[PDB]
């Protein structure tokens, strides 16, 4: 085991993950060891490779859910269920196709963390996230 | 499986790989069949593919370490290609690399640089005769 | 698995599949989960895969056989998807076909028209009420 | 088993395969059951699928060798591991890159059949072939 978490996010949500989340975690004290998929990996796309082995070499895996993540990043996983979900923006459970089940399942169960649209509550969001990670 | 070794290096440490090691390994008798990174990858296909097909079509992969390579090439072999479990891979430490200067995300390489299991290019021309003796020794293992 | 069954059919045989089979299966109670070939296959993906992403994403595969079908869409499963050895796959037979008009390259489909293992869709405006019951039971099987 | 033989060839040698070869066999009597790869399968490219399986469904496997066969068809074999070879055009064992070795093997095994450069021997070319095919 090498990192405390594998963060699977989408190139669009990149800003949030590589900037803000990285700030509230990799710059914590003591710091968290993060393996950001989109930042650390060759921007080419894959599966067997790393992902699993990279995941299995990190204490936890974070899926930064959002509509962007559905379009382009989920598609693979459907085709770890330990796993920490993060709902960055509200996704319409319905608006989610019926061919993307495992998501729905893992979704509805509610083993997820919801990022707040209210600046004030962010301070707490992390607190729960770090806790979840360090769980 | 057509090569003896797939040498992966940085353009920075070019001269050495191309003008010293190659001579040393290719001319040696008998000679070695080498696949060469920044000097001989096939068109069309994208690099990473070439890199793979190479890593795949050759007995061993010889990595030429150097702060500049750790900064621009090593990420690949420890992540995107983790599934290749390359860590039999031979490592050459061309120059010195302080451990603490190694990105924290690179645990395989850190374990490498701690286990001191790499061929270290000597600065005393005298000792190279031996360097070369283990490099082949290694490749041909 | 994310779908109860994946219906593979021609475009000439739609009304049947898309209006009846749907009504009878996607409106039962409790309703079924169906993946209709010429209806829910995504764009950004190439058909073949689009298929493999359904075959595997469903408990069973329903092959609405017809004359047209064999002509315009059977090949795919005779060799392309011949590694999946689909022959648990349900085989419907919506209309008659002369076993002599079936291409000789379609070995497997031959065996299909011999062991006559499939649900033939009846002309009997009465014996049909039982086709769909044999259908569901094949799916839910 | 179901096919008399399998034909692996480069899209660029089709006119010879999908034409001369066929009108010489699939149109013989009794006709041969041939499954030409570039002709019958979907133009998508793969490996596990078909090929080995479709191969395990023919009494033989015929490779139509030629510079074009290497540029687009052999690369696939060299990486993965009865066989009738049909050298269409003379291919110098030199031009064969050091990365096409399982090839220089089969090649330097001279277990092939050459396409004659003289109209005369043509009619004969087809004989030896049909032989090896049915044999």
Swiss-Prot record, chains B, C:
Induction comment: (Microbial infection) In macrophages, induced by SARS-CoV-2 infection.
Ranges of the Cytoplasmic topological domain: 1-141
Subcellular location: Membrane; Cytoplasmic vesicle, Phagosome membrane; Membrane raft
Residue ranges of the motif ATG16L1-binding motif: 118-135
Expression sites (tissue/organ): Highly expressed in peripheral blood leukocytes, in particular in monocytes, in bone marrow, lymph node and in spleen. Also detected in lung and in fetal liver. Levels are low in other tissues.
Record note on what altering residue 111 to R does: Loss of PPP1R11-mediated ubiquitination and degradation
Biological role stated in the UniProt entry: Cooperates with LY96 to mediate the innate immune response to bacterial lipoproteins and other microbial cell wall components. Cooperates with TLR1 or TLR6 to mediate the innate immune response to bacterial lipoproteins or lipopeptides. Acts via MYD88 and TRAF6, leading to NF-kappa-B activation, cytokine secretion and the inflammatory response. May also activate immune cells and promote apoptosis in response to the lipid moiety of lipoproteins.
Quaternary data: Interacts with LY96, TLR1 and TLR6 (via extracellular domain). TLR2 seems to exist in heterodimers with either TLR1 or TLR6 before stimulation by the ligand. The heterodimers form bigger oligomers in response to their corresponding ligands as well as further heterotypic associations with other receptors such as CD14 and/or CD36. Binds MYD88 (via TIR domain). Interacts with TICAM1. Interacts with CNPY3. Interacts with ATG16L1. Interacts with PPP1R11. Interacts with TICAM2. Interacts with TIRAP.
This protein's domain notes: Ester-bound lipid substrates are bound through a crevice formed between the LRR 11 and LRR 12.
Protein name: Toll-like receptor 2
Source organism of this protein record: Homo sapiens
Record gene name: TLR2
Region of the whole protein represented: 639 to 784 of 784
UniProtKB/Swiss-Prot annotation, chain D:
Induction: (Microbial infection) In macrophages, induced by SARS-CoV-2 infection.
Free-text description of this protein's post-translational modifications in UniProt: Ubiquitinated at Lys-105 by PPP1R11, leading to its degradation. Deubiquitinated by USP2.
Documented effect of changing residue 105 to R: Loss of PPP1R11-mediated ubiquitination and degradation
Span of domain TIR: 1-133
Crosslinked positions (Glycyl lysine isopeptide (Lys-Gly) (interchain with G-Cter in ubiquitin)): 105
Source domain of life: Eukaryota
Effect noted on mutating residue 43 to F: Abolishes the interaction with MYD88. No effect on oligomerization or on the structure of the TIR domain
Cytoplasmic topological domain: 1-135
Effect of residue 76 to R: Reduced protein stability
Tissue expression as described in the entry: Highly expressed in peripheral blood leukocytes, in particular in monocytes, in bone marrow, lymph node and in spleen. Also detected in lung and in fetal liver. Levels are low in other tissues.
Entry's localization field: Membrane; Cytoplasmic vesicle, Phagosome membrane; Membrane raft
Motif ATG16L1-binding motif, residue range(s) on this chain: 112-129
Subunit structure: Interacts with LY96, TLR1 and TLR6 (via extracellular domain). TLR2 seems to exist in heterodimers with either TLR1 or TLR6 before stimulation by the ligand. The heterodimers form bigger oligomers in response to their corresponding ligands as well as further heterotypic associations with other receptors such as CD14 and/or CD36. Binds MYD88 (via TIR domain). Interacts with TICAM1. Interacts with CNPY3. Interacts with ATG16L1. Interacts with PPP1R11. Interacts with TICAM2. Interacts with TIRAP.
Primary role: Cooperates with LY96 to mediate the innate immune response to bacterial lipoproteins and other microbial cell wall components. Cooperates with TLR1 or TLR6 to mediate the innate immune response to bacterial lipoproteins or lipopeptides. Acts via MYD88 and TRAF6, leading to NF-kappa-B activation, cytokine secretion and the inflammatory response. May also activate immune cells and promote apoptosis in response to the lipid moiety of lipoproteins.
Domain remarks in the Swiss-Prot or TrEMBL record: Ester-bound lipid substrates are bound through a crevice formed between the LRR 11 and LRR 12. The ATG16L1-binding motif mediates interaction with ATG16L1.
Protein's recorded name: Toll-like receptor 2
Protein encoded by which gene: TLR2
Parent-protein residues present: 639 to 784 of 784
